[model samples]
Target: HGSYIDITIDLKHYNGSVFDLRLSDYHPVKKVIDIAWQAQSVSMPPREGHWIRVVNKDKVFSGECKLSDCGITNGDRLEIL
Candidate 1:
């Protein structure tokens, strides 16, 4: 069935440590979220689905990412195997 689907992954804050990461899509087997960093053009190792690298001045840490969409309501996990 066709439905009104508006799939848009929005990034409200680009002022994060790992803000340079580019998201391709979500996966659900490798237990990893697929992403691409500015430095690492290729998709780096699968990052945990619940963490977002946050840069704090000189301290580097991971934050959280908010993803919402009709296609991925339950959430899509990634596994790099």
Candidate 2:
């Protein structure tokens, strides 16, 4: 349970091209999330909010959230959970 927003898109290529995601400047790190947990080497850090926590490597979990820009319509929404 962490929150923040701004990043428009980032597919998860990490470190490089994965659409070479454009849109930037709206930084607010601390958004790392995991529903129904299952992570490994989970050094999450994709900008625009970066709060990571699911490093069970593989174990217990459960969760959910929104999508499409604030209040819905396009993409991405966290309401600063």
In angstroms, the error of model 1 at 65 is: 3.8
For residues 1-81, write the lDDT of model 2, one tens digit per residue. Answer: 323333332223343221211222122222223320122232443333333222222221222223211222223322211
> Could you give candidate 1's per-residue lDDT for residues 1-81 as a string of tens digits?
222222222122332222222232243211122332333333333334434322121222222322222133222221111
What's the residue-level lDDT of 32 in candidate 1? 21
User: How much is the lDDT of residue 66 in candidate 1?
Assistant: 29
- Stretches of model 2 off by over 4 angstroms after superposition: 1-8, 11-13, 20-63, 68-70, 75-81
Return the TM-score for each candidate structure. Answer: 0.21, 0.18
Name the best candidate (by lDDT).
Answer: 1
TM-score of 2: 0.18
Error of 2 at 74 (Å): 2.9
**What is each predicted model's overall lDDT from 0 to 1?**
0.27, 0.26
Task: Give residue 71's error in model 2 in angstroms.
Answer: 2.1
